[PDB]
Design a protein around this ligand. Structure first.
Ligand SMILES: CC(=O)N[C@H]1[C@H](O[C@H]2[C@@H](O)[C@@H](NC(C)=O)[C@H](O[C@H]3[C@H](O)[C@H]4N=C(N(C)C)O[C@H]4[C@@H]3CO)O[C@@H]2CO)O[C@H](CO)[C@@H](O)[C@H]1O
Ligand SMILES: CC(=O)N[C@H]1[C@H](O[C@H]2[C@@H](O)[C@@H](NC(C)=O)[C@H](O[C@H]3[C@H](O)[C@H]4N=C(N(C)C)O[C@H]4[C@@H]3CO)O[C@@H]2CO)O[C@H](CO)[C@@H](O)[C@H]1O
Ligand SMILES: [Zn+2]
Ligand SMILES: [Zn+2]
Ligand SMILES: [Zn+2]
Length: 364
């Protein structure tokens, strides 16, 4: 089984003990470590932070402690948008330039592969034709990586992609069967199902639907996302179940109405370290002393509330449940976003270092 873990290069800017650098990484924890995020300039893979060249060397240098570890560099992300991808995949010359730059960039810094995180082809402003151009990009990369390993004598570069769980986004941008044949693995982003953009509370990553949900809403859960990718053509062994080490928060309209589905007036207060209203790292959820914890029985996940604040998140128990689920489905493993949001130095939760991700390592 694979345990794919994402590192983010902006976590190094958080305050105090929340600051995260490659030295905070445990090389033995995961099977694959993915570096988020590289960007694109003139159709070529590029760095995004002042010290990326040093961080890349430190990150890949972890393989000197664990040679079995595979590292990948992720390009894109939610904030990256779609314009640069659309433009890059539109012509054979742009695709060639990007592919050749990817090979040179990855070899230069000792990465073992590339993780595509285009969010998303066929949506967010990207035309419907990008569904087919995304396929061509995946094929071009897989082909170029295959040939380069043969000419260089080095281990073949890996190709993975982070993909959406929402049925509407899957149908709009992915020829699932085709890309699954050329990707080494698929990192299913089975989270962000509900959030503060809604007027009601809802869990970020529920395993199953609530009895009360039907229609399109009945597909806003991990199980539905998984079934969709498998039914559409993804071999089970290539489907990696993504799990969040963060939760999504809400400000309740009333501290007396605290159920999942209760009215909400907006995002929950920003975390003192993550500072993005609407989400909280697991270590920020751990500091909620005096809060009431509840388990959503239908969905197998927890949430906590204190006064008018409500947050749906994942804990050791829900991670154990999800691993039990993925094993029963025969999935290739688990993926986690992100290392720097787990209690990576065991400071906040008194559950040791990486309580959530260590749980994945042990259960898998
Ligand atoms: C580089 C950058 O824009 N940095 C921003 C930072 O943006 C982040 C956060 O909003 C992340 N959100 C959370 C809850 O972690 C967000 O995570 C996305 C990611 O883009 C997607 N890709 C994956 N993969 C598995 C590849 O998973 C999803 C996750 C979870 O939905 O990523 C964006 C950057 O794209 O936000 C902070 C706070 O607003 C800001 O200071 C700055 O550092
Ligand atoms: C609260 C708000 O308006 N914006 C948030 C932003 O919320 C986004 C992201 O969390 C999306 N995450 C990813 C990886 O795309 C999330 O996508 C989910 C959602 O269930 C469906 N909506 C989309 N879109 C492309 C809109 O795709 C699916 C996927 C599930 O497959 O949607 C929410 C709401 O739009 O999150 C960022 C990062 O935390 C935050 O800075 C803020 O911009
Ligand atoms: Zn430190
Ligand atoms: Zn261009
Ligand atoms: Zn919802």
């Amino acid at each position: 089984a694979k345990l794919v873990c994402y590192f983010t290069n902006w976590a190094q800017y958080r305050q105090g003990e929340a600051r995260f650098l490659p030295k905070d990484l445990d090389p033995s924890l995961c099977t694959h470590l993915i570096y988020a995020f590289a960007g694109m300039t003139n159709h070529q893979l590029s760095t995004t932070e002042w010290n990326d060249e040093t961080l890349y060397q430190e990150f890949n240098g972890l393989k000197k402690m664990n040679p079995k570890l595979k590292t990948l560099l992720a390009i894109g992300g939610w904030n990256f948008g779609t314009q640069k991808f659309t433009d890059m995949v539109a012509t054979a010359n742009n695709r060639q330039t990007f592919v050749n730059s990817a090979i040179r960039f990855l070899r230069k810094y000792s990465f073992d592969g590339l993780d595509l995180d285009w969010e998303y082809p066929g949506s967010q402003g990207s035309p419907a034709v990008d569904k087919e151009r995304f396929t061509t990009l995946v094929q071009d990369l897989a082909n170029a990586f295959q040939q380069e390993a043969q000419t260089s004598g080095k281990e073949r570069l890996l190709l993975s992609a982070a993909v959406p769980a929402g049925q509407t986004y899957v149908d709009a941008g992915y020829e699932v069967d085709k890309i699954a044949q050329n990707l080494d693995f698929v990192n299913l982003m089975a989270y962000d199902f509900h959030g503060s953009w809604e007027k009601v509370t809802g869990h970020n990553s529920p395993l199953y639907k609530r009895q009360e949900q039907s229609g399109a809403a009945a597909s806003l859960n991990v199980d539905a996302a998984v079934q969709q990718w498998l039914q559409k053509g993804t071999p089970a062994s290539k489907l990696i179940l993504g799990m969040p080490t963060y939760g999504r928060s809400f400000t309740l309209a009333s501290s007396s109405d605290t159920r999942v589905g209760a009215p909400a007036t907006g995002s929950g207060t920003p975390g003192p370290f993550t500072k993005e209203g609407g989400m909280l790292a697991y270590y920020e959820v751990c500091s909620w002393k005096g809060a009431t914890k509840q388990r959503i029985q239908d969905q197998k996940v927890p949430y906590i509330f204190r006064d008018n604040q409500w947050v749906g998140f994942d804990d050791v128990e829900s991670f154990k449940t999800k691993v039990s689920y993925l094993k029963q489905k025969g999935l290739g493993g688990a993926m986690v976003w992100a290392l720097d949001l787990d209690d990576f130095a065991g400071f906040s939760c008194n559950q040791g270092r990486y309580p959530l991700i260590q749980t994945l390592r042990q259960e898998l």
